[PDB]
Design a binder for this molecule. Sequence first.
Ligand SMILES: CN(C)CCNc1nc2cc(O)ccc2c2c1C(=O)c1ccccc1-2
Ligand SMILES: CN(C)CCNc1nc2cc(O)ccc2c2c1C(=O)c1ccccc1-2
Ligand SMILES: CN(C)CCNc1nc2cc(O)ccc2c2c1C(=O)c1ccccc1-2
Ligand SMILES: CN(C)CCNc1nc2cc(O)ccc2c2c1C(=O)c1ccccc1-2
Ligand SMILES: CN(C)CCNc1nc2cc(O)ccc2c2c1C(=O)c1ccccc1-2
Lengths: 347, 345, 345, 347, 347
Amino acid sequence: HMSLENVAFNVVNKGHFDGQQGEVPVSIINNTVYTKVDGVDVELFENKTTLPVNVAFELWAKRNIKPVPEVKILNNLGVDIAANTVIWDYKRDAPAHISTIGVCSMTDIAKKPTETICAPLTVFFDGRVDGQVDLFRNARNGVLITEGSVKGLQPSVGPKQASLNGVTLIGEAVKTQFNYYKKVDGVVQQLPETYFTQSRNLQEFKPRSQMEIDFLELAMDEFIERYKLEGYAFEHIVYGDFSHSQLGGLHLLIGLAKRFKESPFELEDFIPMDSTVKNYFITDAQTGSSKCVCSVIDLLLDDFVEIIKSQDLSVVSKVVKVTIDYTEISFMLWCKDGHVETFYPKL
Amino acid sequence: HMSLENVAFNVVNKGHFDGQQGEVPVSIINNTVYTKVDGVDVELFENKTTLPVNVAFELWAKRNIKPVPEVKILNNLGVDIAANTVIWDYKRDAPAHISTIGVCSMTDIAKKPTETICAPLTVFFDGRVDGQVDLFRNARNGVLITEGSVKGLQPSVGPKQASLNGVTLIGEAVKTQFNYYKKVDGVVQQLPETYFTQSRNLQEFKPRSQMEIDFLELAMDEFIERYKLEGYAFEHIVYGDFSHSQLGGLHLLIGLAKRFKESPFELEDFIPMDSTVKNYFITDAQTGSSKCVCSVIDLLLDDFVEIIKSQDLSVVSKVVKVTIDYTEISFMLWCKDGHVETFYP
Amino acid sequence: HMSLENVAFNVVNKGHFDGQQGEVPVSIINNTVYTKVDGVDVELFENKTTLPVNVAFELWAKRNIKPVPEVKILNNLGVDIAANTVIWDYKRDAPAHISTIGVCSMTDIAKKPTETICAPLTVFFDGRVDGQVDLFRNARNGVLITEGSVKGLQPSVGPKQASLNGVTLIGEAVKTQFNYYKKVDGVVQQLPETYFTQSRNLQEFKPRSQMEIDFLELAMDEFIERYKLEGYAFEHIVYGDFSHSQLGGLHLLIGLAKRFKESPFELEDFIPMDSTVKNYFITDAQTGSSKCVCSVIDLLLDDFVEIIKSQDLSVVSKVVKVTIDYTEISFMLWCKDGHVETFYP
Amino acid sequence: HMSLENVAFNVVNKGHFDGQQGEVPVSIINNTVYTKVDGVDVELFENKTTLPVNVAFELWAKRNIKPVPEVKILNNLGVDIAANTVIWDYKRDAPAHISTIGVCSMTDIAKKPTETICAPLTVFFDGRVDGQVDLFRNARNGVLITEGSVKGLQPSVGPKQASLNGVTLIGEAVKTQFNYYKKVDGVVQQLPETYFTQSRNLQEFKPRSQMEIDFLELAMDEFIERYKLEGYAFEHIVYGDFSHSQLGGLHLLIGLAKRFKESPFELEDFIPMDSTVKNYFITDAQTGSSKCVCSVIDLLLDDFVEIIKSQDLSVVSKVVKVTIDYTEISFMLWCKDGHVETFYPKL
Amino acid sequence: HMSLENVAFNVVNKGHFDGQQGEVPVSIINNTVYTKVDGVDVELFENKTTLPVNVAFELWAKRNIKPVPEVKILNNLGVDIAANTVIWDYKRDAPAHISTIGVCSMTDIAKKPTETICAPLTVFFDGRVDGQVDLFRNARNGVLITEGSVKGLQPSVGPKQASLNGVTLIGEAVKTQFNYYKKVDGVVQQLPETYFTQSRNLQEFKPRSQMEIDFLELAMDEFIERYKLEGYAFEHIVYGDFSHSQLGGLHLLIGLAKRFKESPFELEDFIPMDSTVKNYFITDAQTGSSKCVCSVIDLLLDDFVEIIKSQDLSVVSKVVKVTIDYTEISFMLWCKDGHVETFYPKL
Ligand SMILES: CN(C)CCNc1nc2cc(O)ccc2c2c1C(=O)c1ccccc1-2
Ligand SMILES: CN(C)CCNc1nc2cc(O)ccc2c2c1C(=O)c1ccccc1-2
Ligand SMILES: CN(C)CCNc1nc2cc(O)ccc2c2c1C(=O)c1ccccc1-2
Ligand SMILES: CN(C)CCNc1nc2cc(O)ccc2c2c1C(=O)c1ccccc1-2
Ligand SMILES: CN(C)CCNc1nc2cc(O)ccc2c2c1C(=O)c1ccccc1-2
């Protein structure tokens, strides 16, 4: 007996859908779900999705509450749909996938991922759930995560971090680093060598290497000296140039983090979604320096240094391709007289 | 297991809530309830009430589908709430009463009408349902209908007509004339002698007496002659005067019906609810004669004639009170030289 | 003390805003205004405009309830705004003009039409209201209607019909034919000689000449013979050709009216507004003949005949300009071998 | 002349409804009330209630702007409705009570609390308003607060704190500790002995005893030693256990406060209302330890210690009842071998 | 080819409308504009205006992204409309002006400011845009800003600060101090001598003089001694009196800033718009002292001192007028025995 009232009962009593029997009184108004508690209405859910309020509510209640891959990873791997779960996208406050399998009568295209309607879709399978490894083996198109070895399959080791209830973290009490596998048209793929973004935020940025600690602590000139980064235009690319009306560079999150601690600025996230590369409209409050489209990526600084030090610097401009989060990211490299002028990603 | 999806299953399979088990998929968008049929969304309900969409839906699904009193009667008798049913008001496309008893978890103030929260409210009880006569006897404030006698309780014979799924009718396959009873502060009240309005509509108006047939068929002068209605200003009150920019008279539905057949006009129902007396903004399409507030009542013409012929006509202006549909309706009577000038509710 | 609650009190008690003091309880939900009557919510107004619900409500309550020019006339004369009234557009269920003068604190650009903000706008003035003729004289841009002469001002006699509470009519109890005047940049303009459209509707179409009676009663061939309309392609233009997948002709309302009586069809009014020329998507239910854009005008047939009989027919194709409802309507005239092929607005 | 426009005039000119004459222009759209200022629309109110926008607006404008009991107290005492005021619930952004008396034509069931429609309802009366003590004496069902003695009536001394415009505070410039009285079916009640919750928040938590200061300053083991709390499982119940995927314990706000200062975590308030016991879905960002339903109460630590030290510890599991904020709160006590395993409230 | 989809393409690709050709898929729901990215809907804009969602979206996309005068300045100067730009009001999240010129087919009253429909309106002209100085010269009613001299016209030097993408700042990489000019009925006006508000915020308040540094650092009594402010009731007006239920004084932002650092309080901005004088409902969390209408202005403290020291103190009460931000602000001055009692602005 699946129902709006039963979903609400679960949310009230268990914090999420947990398959318990029961009903509470519910009111729907203003894209909002309320329940009655002691004669008054209490908000349980505000719909921010493009689905009907009651459907969005159910999908949210049925969200995966274990560590799951960040949505940017799933997107980059071509995932269309999940087997028997909902990946909730906390960046969009909406389901990561528009359809479901065995979750919700209004969004389900199928009850089981083996139905032929699923064949053309890349289905996400979670090896931590009994039976899902086998379903991946039978699926035409799919992506699988596991915590350990799968007999016969070569793994790709994924990022250290995963999302738990919208908190991106590196697990200590729980495992967040998965093995990844992928199948296309019934054939297992070799996933490419890749860097991974670090998924940090501007304000509570934690360094993850000695070089990052050095970057944060040292002044610009000493850092560049120590790591012998002369000619790589770090002053521009990483630290940023706030001297002109158009803000120069500032393409690495760690650089934004450093600046923010010194002097606050505004970041407009004008396409608010999870992605490997983010585009921001930045206004520096101290100087008035601004830029409409500032491309930003959170690479470990050491990774960024490896990338820029692995390029030929003998041409004015060219596109540099880098596998990051399993996708091909295009960077523009501008050089002059054998040194870098700038280097930035394209979204 | 009451639920949105179960209510929808009942509506889809049984046409209304009928206590069947089952669920269908539902989508709610704005004020509309949809169900999925073969991959597409089909509208089941558009909310026109001031309640939440899913609540209004349930109340509508649980509406009484037997003949029930017209809402104007219930309102006139001071009914606040119904015991274990929903009276759906088809004039408002909304519940007649905002709260319920034993119907819906979101609107219920009680599960049974004996709870002390119900004591100050006038609860409607339906004697056709087992147990409800006894509940009326124990209730402090209430209105009861029955199809037959209740031992010891003095009845008031109600209107001939009732509402069945929003159709007002005089039943042949079903009974629509009830006995009425009322209690206030624990004490049974004597309901007053009353006329009843006829609940007809302008376009499909059916006469219900020889006098009404005569009114519709005969020209003004011969009708007035035959029923000896000289000096009662029927030409004004009933037929209406369309000769000036302000429309004169036209206070009886039958008069509106006659004119409508001859020449169409616009009626704006600017307070769209069920009531004994209705107010309309009328514009006559043929002449341009109009009036912002035209008070209209559907009395049997014979009843209207009895009322107006039972007045003293020796005073310029006077308020005349008449019990109709159990309520006191005030009429203004204007006279001059021993004849009526006008008479309107 | 202007207020939502006071507007509602007026609507409830007087049918429209009438400047009475008082308040009733009001609820606003989405785009609907409700008032509380005996414990329940009754709808007073559903907002179909692009204004805020409470503002649209007030403008509607303050609508002009006298005969006023049809909106198509006001639009054709370039009217931007009204002085101290609201012209309600019943075709759009919205105000004819987005701003007001001396009506409503939320929409007013001025309290009096003499304020300099009004100077660039063509302000509508109603000579039936004290002071408005004088305001027109002082206004830089304006349109004036009156029921009689204004000393020194050369009149244009307007259409016979006007709109009274959304009913287009030729007044008998009230005057609906106005004199018109217009000023541009401080200078009175000579309004052109014009035909007027008749503002009839498909279903309740009434002929207004012997020729129109003949058209409706006679078969095609005898009508054309009697009025000697050979070579003017009336069979195409007026009667319509339903023989092919694309519907031919059918550009006069009277022709639509005749066919509708014989055999129903669908008309999609895909730009639902008042205008001199209307465009419809027509599907003929009997034959399946259809046309996405069928241009239709309601001219008195006699006027249409005068127009088409006053053309030179020696050129293949030509634009014919005709003043109708004070605006220049372009017609395409297609000829071949000295006869008309088609003629449409 | 009560009206939408008059309410708006009061809000604009006086900050709340204050009975002044006047009108401003108002627009209603999008569950929002706007007023026109110099040719442009300014938002005055966004409706988050289940009432009509214009009605919610009026009730909010007519909210009590003196210190008033927290809603959890009023709820716990069975209050249904207030006499001649509106208690605004700032946790729900809505009226605490669905009906009114002498406030608003759309919500009023009565103009005076003596009308017989009020008899079955528990009416809240404020002794600081002239006449209300007498109205309580005549009422069948009611709750009364005063600042001082009422002849003949034994008081219950309420919490130190009250709510002033949604700020919970202990008054210095104003009195916030009331005497409470209650009547049921025309009979004055003896209110029970009760603990009170402290109504603090996680981030700006202020200790209110030496023991709380000690808890915040000292490390776990020294605190437990000093207050001789061995065997009471404080390490679990108060400090929390973040070592496993399921977060253990953490049922006292002060424990949450301590952890939060050390290491931030996410709290989902999935039933956002005022209540003595709160249920949160917690995700610890550092470890990945989480729990869907973590029951949390803000008792003075000394009170909590008194409660746990006043229990028999000789049974595996049982329900412990405690009067808090005038209501009976059920706790589960789990023991083993004469020591506590865990102890937590139920909502 | 102007269109919803083209506006969205510009927002996605350029961060704002920049005249680029292209279209993306768009969904409109819930006063919200979404675009489709890789099979899912991403929010681009939430309409908080009283305009249609798609129109508000376009105006926002076409907002001026250079430093522009704060809206309070434009309002104070009587500006009705802007020539060929949109001034976005970030305080209201809406256009500063209801109509446009040469911006948007749905809001335009004209394509060029020379059309006669514009004659009665005060049109804002930006001298940094080619041709606009000349348009001001031909306009009947207008306000002009420039960065430098205009031949023949005497300038008024405006505030140091301007708004850049909703960030009020004093430019270093960009110019934010403009020359102002104004025309009424075809005649150039002499703008009055004026003080300017400083446009700071409570939490990140930066002093801009030695006196302000002293105010923030020194205790009350020493500050008053040093600047010889005895008898001017600074203890009341600037510092505030929290000793009674009604909060006394506290009319200068710097005073609020000082208090806030010591002890947080609640400020309800009940008319949320840009204005020279702001009215707040204040509740002090520490004491419970409150006031429904607390008028607050951010004057440089030195300016405030000059103003109060330039008044006659020999009458009980009177209105003091002060030109601030080009408008006449009325203050009430209350005196007794030759000293100030209080002094506060009226909104
Ligand atoms: C264990 N280490 C490898 C990294 C620990 N270092 C830091 N952790 C932080 C954690 C935070 O939540 C915020 C700032 C932090 C900072 C460091 C630094 O080394 C550092 C240097 C300069 C500014 C901030 C931090
Ligand atoms: C049993 N009789 C007393 C009523 C039968 N007479 C009529 N029935 C009608 C039923 C309809 O559905 C519509 C019009 C009706 C009319 C009569 C009339 O006698 C009469 C006279 C003039 C106009 C209409 C009707
Ligand atoms: C005063 N006369 C010029 C007009 C009277 N003639 C008609 N009046 C009608 C009034 C209606 O409400 C509906 C149809 C009508 C028709 C006529 C006709 O002559 C005629 C011919 C063919 C069809 C309908 C009508
Ligand atoms: C007057 N005393 C009884 C209590 C004063 N002590 C504290 N007040 C605080 C007020 C705040 O707004 C935030 C943290 C506070 C803290 C104390 C502590 O003693 C303490 C110890 C460890 C961390 C925070 C605080
Ligand atoms: C360059 N000087 C003229 C001003 C620099 N002084 C300050 N800047 C601040 C910038 C901030 O973002 C926040 C607080 C600040 C404070 C000062 C002070 O002098 C001061 C004194 C007491 C409290 C805060 C500040």
